[PDB]
Amino acid sequence: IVDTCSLASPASVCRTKHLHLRCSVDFTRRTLTGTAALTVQSQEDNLRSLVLDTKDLTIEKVVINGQEVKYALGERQSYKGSPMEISLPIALSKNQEIVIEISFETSPKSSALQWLTPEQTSGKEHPYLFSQCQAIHCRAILPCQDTPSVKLTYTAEVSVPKELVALMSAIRDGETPDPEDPSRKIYKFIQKVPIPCYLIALVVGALESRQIGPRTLVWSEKEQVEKSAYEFSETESMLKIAEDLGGPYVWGQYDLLVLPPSFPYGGMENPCLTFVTPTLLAGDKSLSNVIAHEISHSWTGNLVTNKTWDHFWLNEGHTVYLERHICGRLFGEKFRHFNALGGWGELQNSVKTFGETHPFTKLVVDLTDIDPDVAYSSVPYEKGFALLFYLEQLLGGPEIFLGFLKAYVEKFSYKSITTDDWKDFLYSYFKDKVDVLNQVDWNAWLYSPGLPPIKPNYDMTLTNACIALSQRWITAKEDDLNSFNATDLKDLSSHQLNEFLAQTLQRAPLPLGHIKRMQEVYNFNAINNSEIRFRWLRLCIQSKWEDAIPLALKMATEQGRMKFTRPLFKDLAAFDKSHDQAVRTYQEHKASMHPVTAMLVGKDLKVD
Ligand SMILES: CN(CCCOc1ccc(Cc2ccccc2)cc1)CCC(=O)O
Ligand SMILES: [Cl-]
Ligand SMILES: [Cl-]
Ligand SMILES: [Yb+3]
Ligand SMILES: [Yb+3]
Ligand SMILES: [Yb+3]
Ligand SMILES: [Yb+3]
Ligand SMILES: [Yb+3]
Ligand SMILES: [Yb+3]
Ligand SMILES: [Yb+3]
Ligand SMILES: [Zn+2]
C-alpha cells in the first residue's frame, strides 16, 4: 500500500503524532518563517533516519535533544518537491517518541499559499494571506509526512502584523502582543483531534466576524460580513441534519471564512473553519449546497480519511451523498433527485472532456507520476456519488443506506482507509444482502474508465421542465424564435435555470441568432448567480457571440474559482475572435494569480 504522491517515510516506518508550529508571517518578504516541532513515533526497531516531504522550503537547521543534527535535501522530483532525510542521533526503539524541531522558511512561490497585496483585497489597506494544502501542498509550508495516511494533532503560535487577524483550522487559544516585536500580535491555536496534514490551514488578513448560529461565526473582510451572514444562515440547520446522519460533531465549532475572490475552489473543509469562495454570495442562499458539502466532510473526509489520494473518491462520493441528503431533508426528496441527476450530467461532461478511456475517469485512480492537481475533476465526486446512489437503490433505499453510512463513519473514525477497507465493511454490514452486492460489477465501477456500467433511477419531476425548454431551443428554427418569451422562465427556480443552461450547453454551439434571442427575452446577462452566469457565458462564447468576450474575460479574471476560470479561459482560447486577448490576459494576470490556478490555466492554454 503505497502513497505514490509522498517522498516521506511511510506510516509503517514512523508516524507524526503532533506538530507544534511557531511562525511569523512576513508580508514584506512573502515568507513564513519559524519552527515545526514534530513529535514522531517510531514504528520500527533500531530506527536511525527518516524522510520528510518538502517543497521550496529553505531549511536552516534540525534540532533533536537540544543539538543540531545532520540532514540532507535530495534532488527535486517535480511537483512532489524534495525529500529531506534526517539522521537521528540515537537509534529509536519501536513506539519510542521524540521531538524533531526544524527551523525553516517558505518561498514566495509556495504552491500552498497566495499572498495578496492590499489592492487585491476588499478594504484596499492591508495585505492578505491564505493557504490551501489539499492535496499535497502542506509540504510547501512546512516539512512533514505529507500523506493522508498519517494523522496528528497540532498547536500553533503565529506572529502577524498587529492590525491583522490570523485564523487556523483549529480552536482559537488567545492573542497577545508579540514581545519580540510590538508591531505584531501572536495568535495561538489548538487542534486536539488528529487530522491529516492536508487539513492544516492558515489565513491572515483584516478579518471581522459575525455570529450566525450557536456554534458558528462567519469571518470575512468587513465589506462582506453582512451579505455572508445572510447567505450562510442555513448553516446551523444543516449541521443539525448532518449530526443526525453522521453521529456527533467532534470539532467544537463550525466557523466559515469567506475568502477573497482568487480562492481556487468552492470550499475547503478545514476543520473548525471551512473556507469558501465569495462566488457563493448569490443573495438568495441558492448555492448553499457547497456549505452542506463542507459540513458533511466533518464526518466523511475529516474523521474517516482516504489513506492515499488514489482513494479520494471515498472522501468525495460519501460527502456528496451526505450533502444531497441534507438538501433532500431541507427541500424534499424530489430536490435530492434533481441534484443527483444533475450530478450525472456533470459526470457525462467530465468523461467526455477527458475521453471515455482516460485513466482519470476511473473511480480509483493511480497517481503514480501524476500531479494530483492535473487529475482533479468531478469524476471522484459524481462517479463516487453514482455508485453509492446505485447501492442505495439496490439495497433497499435511503433509510437503509443511511444506516450503513452512520455505521461506516463510526467504524473508521480517526482512521485512514482504502477502497478495499470500505468494500469489506460494506459486505460485513450488508451480510444478509450479499447476493445483491455480488451482482454489482465491482471491477467496472471501481477500476474501469468512462461512464459507470449502470445508471441509477432518478425521479425527473423537477428536471422535466428544464429538458423541455432546452429541447425547444435546440430544435427551434429561425421562425420559432419569436415564440420564446420571458414567461417561459416564470415557474423555474434558479436551480432549474441553471439546469436548462447545462442541458443546452451539452449541445453547444447553438446558432448565434438563437443565443441573441435568448438574451433578448430572458436577459441572462443580468443574472449575478455565478453558476448560471458561468454556464450562460460559456454558451455564448462557444456559440461565437463576440459581445460576450469582455463579459467572459471579466468573469474569468475578477474571480479565480477554477471551476469557472479554467473553462472560461479554455472557451475564450478556442474562439478565434478572443484567442489572442485570452492569452494576453492570462500573461497579464499570471504573476498575481493563485499559483495552482496559474499553473493549470497555463497548461490549458498551452502557454508557458
Ligand atoms: C478544495 N478541495 C480540492 C483540492 C484539491 O484536492 C485534490 C484531491 C485529490 C486529488 C487527486 C485525485 C484526483 C482525481 C481523482 C482521484 C484523486 C487532487 C486534488 C476540495 C474540497 C471539497 O471537496 O470539499
Ligand atoms: Cl523543492
Ligand atoms: Cl444564426
Ligand atoms: Yb548552528
Ligand atoms: Yb486556552
Ligand atoms: Yb518570535
Ligand atoms: Yb476482512
Ligand atoms: Yb470480509
Ligand atoms: Yb418552421
Ligand atoms: Yb486588462
Ligand atoms: Zn469534498
PDB file of all heavy atoms in Angstrom, residues 172-174 190, ligand 5:
ATOM      1  N   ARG A 172      -9.299  28.701  18.510  1.00  0.00           N
ATOM      2  CA  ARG A 172      -8.501  29.840  18.927  1.00  0.00           C
ATOM      3  C   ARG A 172      -8.149  29.709  20.402  1.00  0.00           C
ATOM      4  O   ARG A 172      -8.988  29.325  21.210  1.00  0.00           O
ATOM      5  CB  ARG A 172      -9.285  31.128  18.704  1.00  0.00           C
ATOM      6  CG  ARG A 172      -9.523  31.469  17.234  1.00  0.00           C
ATOM      7  CD  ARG A 172     -10.194  32.806  17.149  1.00  0.00           C
ATOM      8  NE  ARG A 172     -11.603  32.693  17.492  1.00  0.00           N
ATOM      9  CZ  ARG A 172     -12.372  33.742  17.684  1.00  0.00           C
ATOM     10  NH1 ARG A 172     -11.830  34.975  17.567  1.00  0.00           N
ATOM     11  NH2 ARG A 172     -13.676  33.545  17.958  1.00  0.00           N
ATOM     12  N   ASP A 173      -6.894  30.024  20.724  1.00  0.00           N
ATOM     13  CA  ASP A 173      -6.383  29.864  22.061  1.00  0.00           C
ATOM     14  C   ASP A 173      -5.709  31.154  22.521  1.00  0.00           C
ATOM     15  O   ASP A 173      -4.712  31.126  23.233  1.00  0.00           O
ATOM     16  CB  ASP A 173      -5.447  28.650  22.073  1.00  0.00           C
ATOM     17  CG  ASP A 173      -5.017  28.233  23.447  1.00  0.00           C
ATOM     18  OD1 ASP A 173      -5.792  28.460  24.397  1.00  0.00           O
ATOM     19  OD2 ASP A 173      -3.853  27.712  23.558  1.00  0.00           O
ATOM     20  N   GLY A 174      -6.270  32.274  22.131  1.00  0.00           N
ATOM     21  CA  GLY A 174      -5.826  33.559  22.661  1.00  0.00           C
ATOM     22  C   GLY A 174      -4.913  34.362  21.735  1.00  0.00           C
ATOM     23  O   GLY A 174      -4.429  33.866  20.706  1.00  0.00           O
ATOM     24  N   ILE A 190      -5.203  25.593  18.882  1.00  0.00           N
ATOM     25  CA  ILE A 190      -5.019  24.188  19.231  1.00  0.00           C
ATOM     26  C   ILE A 190      -6.067  23.337  18.495  1.00  0.00           C
ATOM     27  O   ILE A 190      -7.271  23.661  18.432  1.00  0.00           O
ATOM     28  CB  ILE A 190      -5.126  24.004  20.742  1.00  0.00           C
ATOM     29  CG1 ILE A 190      -4.848  22.532  21.101  1.00  0.00           C
ATOM     30  CG2 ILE A 190      -6.486  24.611  21.208  1.00  0.00           C
ATOM     31  CD1 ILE A 190      -4.778  22.290  22.616  1.00  0.00           C
TER      32      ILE A 190
HETATM   33 YB    YB B   5      -6.979  28.362  26.487  1.00  0.00          YB
END
